[PDB]
Ligand binder design. Structure first.
Ligand code: FE
Ligand code: FE
Lengths: 449, 448
């Protein structure tokens, strides 16, 4: 039946409003009324904001979080990360993958993310042979999301090569590999699995320009022409240099010249762009899939955030390596990367407004577009996906001040979280945290033994 | 003697297992490894040293989260100074004590066991001294006492608004003293800290902009065996103004005109050449790093690898007190380096854990900057330490626990002891809710 949340303040697309009654029916927002008293059966909340998309995740990497911070003996300071990543990637079973993904999605839900964009490349069995059920590993993701009550935009990854110009994939990549034919069949397995997964979106994820040839890129991005396309691009300086050596062009530039890039596309990282690439990307409408915590943890670089925003570019955030899960963590890192690079404060604020406000609104907006859910948000007809904040330490704080306290000062935290109208998180706790954790610790023990 | 048994404890020479720590009169009397818990031992999983928070301006905790609006000014730092001066110029002593208490509770809950209060809010709202000259410093001491927080109090000497002895401006009126009145204030602080167990009293020349060379000589001679702290080279604009005045940057100037040693803690030290960095390390000055505040202010990135390779030591301070956390500070330090050098595990030592190196480093340099080199998980040290909740890392080795805490959000502070007294239990200070009520009342008054 029809259920009501009454919020003392709620951040709607046209701004903060007070005394907001949000009606929910069949998991959808059926009504929003501002300046009204709570009905006697309304559930009362202090501060309500939209659910955040987590637009880029590799669920299995959550298992290695905190384990890649030892330097090791290599001259290459990235060796330890790849060694740990491939130890997990090459041994994880489907049962383990479901357990890890579940506990990750619980952590994301508890942090206020209501949908995940799972950029999924862990496909085949340990020897690189397909599972009897081709989409087995994607089915585990979907099962994990279903159990969590987490929204899912599933983005199976196309990966065939180890370098520019169609270099053969090496044996370490064997569980990731498909040709376009076997990839289409995998996408078909995913579509069947997602039947009855309410709100699910199925797109495609060419891994990167290194990993895919131009012809393969054409085939993959034509499979589901109305659904999202995600791709890693321009994350590390070495890729830009290699791309130039191969084509005479930088990665984003090359992509914009060879594909019809639109808001259908989400370019993950896009960390190293010229001013011209930044503008063209924004003008094309491609969403920047920013992963600020992972980019810092990997030493990738700093995004051209002010230029991108000034050109009308839109963005979202993704936990990516899943080393550390938090909306405040990601947005704060984005802003602070800018403050250090430009020697300035409140860099990503819009007009003379709040930096937390601009970042939060922006990341919700661009995130939902990248997820294929532009109808979503705190709007009539959107999925009933939203978050209440604990403002016990900010008792008189009016809207934007709440966001800045949350994101910069640690003075608020996520309280309740709803997805499709179902309260998955209460007072910061997911209804299945402890059960998910027990299964996660069992899987970790197996993987690390 | 009462006893804590730790399944793992990070001692100065490394992780030890099944460690019995005996405490009496607030100090560590015995350390035994490889043994079971006695029947009256309190049991802990993972115990580490208490962290010094080597640089704090307590009153700025009140403005945390309030300076993140861009505002109409061409100067993107205007809004921070406007908020900072609104609090600085109107706060009463009663309000200052409430703010400092709630801050010191927050610090304790984050695993900091001593605070270096770099204290410059001295006089009344109109810039006239209080009947008790050290009134505001007495409030700091009272707040620290109520929290059970260790205190190295560093009253600040401030006399000028510009290099070369420019007059102090009206906005600085609560901060200012001449050397003679400053010495009298220090004397008030010494009397107040009598019976404050483990307290240290040093001096804090504000910066090279705020002091002349002659004043710097006088202030740093007052307590020759106690710490000296000073802000240096935090912002490019200070560095340029210092050059305009002397032909030198702030740290090189300081090293050339003072006998800088491990007695000195140079706060930020953010803009240095490679040669300055090495000379600072070789002198033995402690880098008072404030990574979260430096990021929030867009100050810059510290020359961390060069400093460490030259044998430099550091600690961490919450500084503006915008966000309080050991993980937050150490992570930000490392990540500032990863982005700047396009590398990972930049501040690891040998081929070790980055979290290990950063944690050990910050405890060590922190305690030296605080005038407490005897401290740590050692016999004779103050019984100041922290247990970590390892429910998500249930049998993980020590270094893995640190990396999980600092980088992955997988462990958190459980209990915290200062001078052998448990001030935090399962993440909560006993006075959290009471201190919070008084804090919100003060905030409401200040923001009215
Ligand atoms: Fe990624
Ligand atoms: Fe400071």
């Amino acid at each position: 039946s029809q259920h009501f949340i009454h919020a003392r303040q709620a951040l709607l697309p046209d701004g903060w409003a007070e005394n907001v009654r949000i009606g929910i029916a069949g998991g959808v927002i059926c009504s929003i009324e501002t300046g009204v008293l709570a009905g006697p059966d309304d559930e009362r909340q202090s501060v309500v904001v939209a659910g955040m998309a987590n637009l880029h995740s590799h669920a299995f990497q959550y298992g290695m979080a905190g384990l890649a911070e030892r330097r090791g003996p290599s001259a290459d300071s990235f060796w330890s990360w790849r060694e740990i990543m491939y130890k997990f990637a090459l041994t994880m079973t489907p049962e383990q993958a479901e357990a890890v993904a579940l506990r990750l999605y619980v952590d994301m839900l508890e942090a206020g993310f209501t949908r995940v964009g799972e950029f999924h490349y862990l496909h085949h069995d340990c020897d690189g042979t397909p599972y009897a059920n081709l989409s087995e590993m994607a089915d585990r993701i979907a099962a994990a999301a279903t159990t969590a009550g987490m929204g899912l935009t599933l983005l199976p990854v196309f990966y065939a090569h180890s370098g520019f110009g169609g270099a053969a994939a090496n044996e370490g990549q064997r569980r990731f590999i498909n040709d376009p034919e076997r990839f289409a069949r995998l996408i078909e397995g995913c579509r069947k699995t997602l039947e009855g997964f309410e709100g699910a979106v199925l797109g495609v994820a060419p891994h990167s320009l290194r990993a895919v040839t131009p012809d393969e890129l054409d085939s993959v991005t034509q499979l589901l022409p109305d659904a999202p396309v995600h791709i890693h691009v321009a994350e590390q300086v070495k890729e830009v240099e290699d791309c130039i050596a191969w084509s005479g062009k930088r990665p984003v530039e090359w992509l914009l010249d060879h594909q019809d890039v639109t808001a259908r596309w989400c370019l993950i990282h896009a960390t190293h762009m010229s001013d011209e690439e930044t503008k063209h990307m924004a003008k094309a409408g491609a969403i920047a899939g920013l992963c600020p915590v992972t980019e810092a943890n990997l030493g990738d670089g700093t995004f051209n955030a002010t230029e991108f925003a000034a050109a009308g570019g839109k963005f979202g955030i993704g936990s990516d390596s899943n080393v550390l899960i938090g909306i405040g963590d990601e947005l704060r890192q984005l802003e602070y990367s800018q403050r250090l690079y430009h020697r300035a404060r409140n860099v990503l604020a819009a007009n003379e407004g709040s930096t937390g406000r601009a970042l939060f609104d922006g990341a919700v907006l661009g995130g939902n577009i990248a997820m294929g859910r532009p109808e979503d948000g705190l709007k009539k007809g959107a999925s009933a996906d939203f978050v209440s904040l604990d403002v016990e330490r900010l008792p008189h704080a009016k809207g934007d001040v709440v966001l800045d306290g949350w994101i910069f000062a640690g003075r608020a935290h996520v309280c309740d979280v709803w997805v499709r109208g179902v309260k998955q998180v209460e007072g910061g706790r997911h209804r299945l945290r402890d059960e998910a954790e027990r299964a996660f610790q069992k899987a970790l023990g197996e993987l690390l033994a």
